[PDB]
Design a protein around this nucleic acid. Structure first.
Lengths: 178, 168, 96, 137, 221
RNA sequence: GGCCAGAACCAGCCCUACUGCAUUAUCCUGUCGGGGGUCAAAAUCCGGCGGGCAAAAGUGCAAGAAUUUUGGGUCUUGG
RNA sequence: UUAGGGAUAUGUGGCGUCAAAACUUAUGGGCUCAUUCUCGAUACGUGAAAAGGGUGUUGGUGGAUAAAUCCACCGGCCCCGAAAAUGGAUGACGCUUAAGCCCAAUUAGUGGUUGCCCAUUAUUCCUUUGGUAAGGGCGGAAACAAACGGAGAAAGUGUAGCCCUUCCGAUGU
RNA sequence: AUCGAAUCGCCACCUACAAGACUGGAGCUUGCUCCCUCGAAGGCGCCAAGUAUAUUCAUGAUCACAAGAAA
């Protein structure tokens, strides 16, 4: 349905002190289902990159950033992830999708499917919608061909939940057991 | 069964979700499974991502480029008259007529019940009005019992029937 | 199994929303005995005198997620000899 | 405390009803009054159509359909709680003839379905594959 | 006769009329084996009388040499000390199905054998059931739904041919035999069916005209 | 009648329906430069300059008296 | 974490049948075909597998030549490596548009906000019993025959408990 | 003949077949257009043998296995 990851902007700093008054107020983008998961992955990069810790820090605001109107776009998502086999591989991939979240949350599902990495080992380096001529991969390069058309073959048509009808009389729609 | 296609604009009806029987116009294509669809003539069928599992394409195609401004779509539905074409379609007859079966007040279901006897009572007379051609297992094997008047209309039953009816 | 509450699949009721319409209706189980015992209108309407019997209940709430609705047979439970046999869900008390 | 109704507003006088229990099952009939306390409704059909006499039927044993009639021409006040006290009686016999004959006309004054008469002559069966729980009434 | 002389004598002493219970008859051509058996197994526990029919044409997923081996691994298992008491191995596809059902039923309780005893399978479509009503189908057990057409599958009757089910030819000759007898009779009726199908549109004309507007509303016109 | 049934009302309890305050900008919508493609355009995309409310968002909080003439259940309580 | 019962709700674990729950949920994304110990599918449970391999398939990183192609390396699932003595075990059947693996959701870009099933658990109601138990009444208020509103009321550890209201606990070698 | 029974949809239009990368018919441009019966319906049954002017029903006394049994 809608993506499972909200897109947060988290802004925070170290609490001011006589050693460091006016800290430097870092900004950060996360894709996380909650704002506590966004607020947690913020203080992860703060102690990992900046040495500041959550008990010594302040959070200035956690608000989400809303997504642009829906159009088909080509997003460029560059992701890393941790394995212990390979020790931090880094990836850049494209995704057809209508929103940043809808692309990034789709990238978590592919890393989890193809590479079996689960959201905590993953960190998204960047995401942007890119113009059309920069799509390298012939698999996503095919969807912006104009006059693109395909039929729907090998479908599975589930009737309305009210109509399920376990035993349906043959070559007719009449339901003998519903 | 006709396959049709998924192109920039098929008209298409939704199969299942909260917008169920409502028609919409395909506009853009998002990867394989996802498609955007708008029908300007029906508000609440605005620009939204739909998923092709839920979407059954029908035979009418409006001509628009991908990602139309929706004023180009509104006029293109008008010029094409697709929605008025599909209005007299025999299925869209039922789909509009199905919505009216759920809303029946039981007096209405009496009114239908009445009709479907009339349509049935006259079709029982109209059909039975063919005696000049007889094909039902009661009327046809009677026709097979005919011509057996030989062994009947001969001297045997000639007296026998004049004995029988007299007793009646 | 906790034998207080039965489970009833009522025909042509396939979803949960369809079960909450039946909360409160009075179910019946129409088995028969061998010898003819006393009966509700006995001797008022002696033509009901017969071997058949019934156990009554009410529909307490939807069980499951599709058309499945629990039952309380009042003051007792149904026999386990009733499993897989015909239960009767009437249309009363009407909430309409 | 003297006369009031907790009866559901969707069951009025004049609403056509479907009797769900009793000697008359599925015969449709006309809801006529509610007795002074929270009472059993007094339904009436011009016995001529259905065969349903004037009887007491409480709210929960009957469905109130959406189709009403104009009963304002029929005098309800001549039905009290007393007429049912003892347990073909002339006192009851010709209390039909002053209602049925009074109600039949009130049917014939309709429009748009001027004849409910046919509709009142019928039975409500649940036939296989109905699901009455999805229906409007 | 199969009925005792008394329940023929009783039925004749009480007269009334011949009786048949309400029975379901499921065709089974190209129904997935293990999905169709589950659905059937749960309808047997609900008190339904089910006649399975055309078991030969049930399907299984995967290559035929593979599902042969699965059944041959099932022959390998017998009671070593006295096989006449060892697990039995049924060949005929109608028997393969009543087992796939049975092992999904509580067959060791009197309601597990009461459910199973209400199922009847067959090869082909036997005259006992050819004409009674219309055959039913299990749309969540169907092959054109359940299997990607790209995957290879098996036909239960062809697998069971190369184990000890030798009746395969006898059945194929009885299916070729009926499907003619039915389609000869079917096209014979095309004279009648078109009469009725004409008499509905011809009745809609002289039928009272306020009703036909209802049929046009609620849609049967 | 200390038995069996229904139906009304009362207290309590449980359940369900009914919604407001903030928030949006990495956004909205013009337009002009690119840029891109096509038979030709538009779009996806970057920048400038105007204007702004996507009027709704799967944003954060929610207190909205269910006989205050009408929501259900209590054979899970007692009258 | 267990006094005897009812309701609602849940935990761990689950919703193809066995077997209660998706009558096989979605209007969710990928990946996987496995021929005789029969691909895989409950942590603890080596209660089974390694080194090494694979132009099976699906991803990624680096470099290179220009209608697209080629070289090196690194993953995912699957396959080979993989041989035991009674017939036999994802628990059985079976599953392949999974009823398998990774990830994710709750009737689905349509409005946010609790899908469903099952505990001697939690919440609450009734009944019991024991307290480091808490509190109240106990100077008979007055009136009052049958015939044609009744009956108790004990200064008390323990009883058929003096009566009542309340609160917590209750398993055990 | 015990026997009083639980069951509650009938059919000589379903009760033939097949396909699902496809099944109304067709044209090149091969995904679009055009034609037809418009591609989402077994029939019937649900209280006047038929949709209209009718006609016994009670007292079986508000629920009770439907007190009913050849559609």
């Amino acid at each position: 349905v809608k993506p499972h990851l909200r897109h947060y902007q988290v802004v925070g700093r170290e609490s001011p002190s006589e050693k460091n008054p006016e800290p430097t107020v870092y900004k950060f983008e996360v894709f996380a289902p909650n704002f506590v998961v966004a607020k947690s992955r913020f203080w992860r990069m703060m102690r990992v990159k900046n040495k500041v810790k959550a008990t010594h820090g302040d959070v200035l605001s956690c608000k989400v950033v809303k997504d642009a109107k829906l159009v088909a776009r080509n997003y460029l998502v560059d992701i890393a992830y941790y394995s212990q086999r390979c020790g931090y591989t880094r990836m850049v991939k494209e995704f057809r999708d209508v929103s940043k979240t809808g692309a990034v949350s789709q990238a978590y599902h592919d890393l989890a499917s193809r590479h079996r990495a689960r959201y905590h080992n993953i960190e998204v380096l960047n995401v942007k919608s890119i113009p059309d001529h920069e799509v390298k991969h012939l698999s996503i390069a095919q969807y912006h061909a104009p006059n693109l058309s395909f039929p729907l073959l090998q479908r599975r048509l589930k009737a309305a939940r009210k109509d399920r009808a376990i035993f349906v009389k043959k070559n007719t729609k009449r339901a003998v057991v519903a | 069964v006709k396959s049709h296609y998924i192109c920039a604009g098929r008209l298409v009806r939704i199969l299942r979700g909260p917008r169920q029987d409502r028609v919409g116009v395909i506009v853009d294509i998002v990867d394989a499974n996802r498609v955007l669809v708008e029908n300007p003539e029906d508000a609440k069928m605005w620009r939204h991502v739909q998923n092709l599992k839920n979407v059954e394409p029908l035979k009418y195609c409006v001509s628009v480029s991908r990602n139309c401004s929706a004023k180009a779509l509104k006029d293109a539905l008008a010029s094409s008259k697709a929605l008025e074409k599909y209005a007299k379609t025999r299925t869209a007859a039922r789909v509009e007529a199905k919505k009216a079966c759920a809303a029946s007040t039981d007096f209405e279901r009496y009114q239908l019940r009445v009709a479907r006897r009339s349509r049935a009572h006259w079709a029982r007379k109209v059909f039975d009005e063919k005696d000049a051609k007889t094909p039902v297992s009661w009327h046809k094997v009677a026709l097979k019992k005919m011509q057996k008047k030989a062994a009947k209309m001969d001297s045997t039953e000639g007296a026998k029937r004049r004995m029988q009816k007299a007793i009646a | 199994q906790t034998k207080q509450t039965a489970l009833v699949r009522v025909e042509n009721v396939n979803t949960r929303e369809d079960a909450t319409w039946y909360v409160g209706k009075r179910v019946c189980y129409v088995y028969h005995g061998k010898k003819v015992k006393r009966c509700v209108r006995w001797s008022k309407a002696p033509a009901r005198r017969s071997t058949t019997r019934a156990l009554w209940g009410r529909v307490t709430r939807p069980h499951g997620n599709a058309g499945m609705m629990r039952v309380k047979f009042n003051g007792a439970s149904v026999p386990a000899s009733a499993i897989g046999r015909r239960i009767r869900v009437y249309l009363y008390p009407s909430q309409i | 405390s003297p006369e009031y109704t907790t009866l559901r507003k969707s069951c009025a006088p004049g609403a056509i009803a479907i009797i769900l229990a009793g000697r008359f099952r599925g015969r449709r009939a006309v809801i006529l009054k509610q007795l002074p306390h929270n009472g059993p409704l007094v339904v009436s059909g011009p016995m001529k159509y259905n065969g349903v006499p004037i009887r007491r039927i409480d709210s929960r044993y009957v469905i109130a359909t959406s189709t009403t009639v104009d009963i304002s021409s029929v005098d309800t006040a001549s039905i009290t709680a007393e007429v049912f006290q003892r347990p073909v009686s002339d006192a009851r016999a010709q209390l039909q003839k002053k209602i049925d004959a009074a109600l039949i006309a009130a049917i014939k004054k309709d429009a748009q379905g001027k004849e409910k008469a046919g509709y009142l002559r019928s039975v409500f069966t649940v036939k296989p594959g109905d699901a009455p729980h999805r229906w409007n009434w | 006769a199969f009925p005792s002389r008394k329940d023929a004598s009783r039925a004749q002493r009480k007269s009334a009329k011949k009786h048949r219970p309400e029975i379901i008859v499921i065709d089974l051509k190209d129904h997935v084996l293990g999905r169709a058996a589950a659905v059937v197994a749960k309808q047997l526990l609900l008190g339904k009388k089910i006649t399975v029919v055309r078991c030969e044409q049930l399907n299984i997923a995967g290559t035929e040499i593979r599902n042969k081996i699965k059944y041959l691994q099932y022959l390998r298992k017998r009671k070593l000390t006295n096989p006449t008491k060892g697990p039995f191995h049924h060949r005929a596809p109608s028997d393969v199905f009543v087992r796939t059902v049975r092992s999904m039923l509580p067959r060791y309780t009197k309601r597990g054998m009461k459910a199973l005893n209400s199922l009847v399978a067959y090869e082909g479509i036997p005259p006992n059931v050819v004409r009674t009503g219309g055959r039913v189908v299990i749309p969540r057990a169907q092959r054109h739904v359940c299997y990607r057409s790209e995957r290879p599958y098996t036909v239960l009757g062809n697998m069971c041919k190369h184990v000890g089910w030798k009746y395969s030819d006898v059945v194929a000759n009885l299916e070729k035999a009926r499907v003619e007898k039915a389609s000869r009779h079917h096209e014979k009726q095309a004279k009648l069916r078109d009469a009725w199908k004409s008499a509905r549109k011809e009745a809609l004309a002289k039928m009272p005209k306020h009703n036909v507007e209802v049929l046009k509303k609620f849609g049967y016109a």
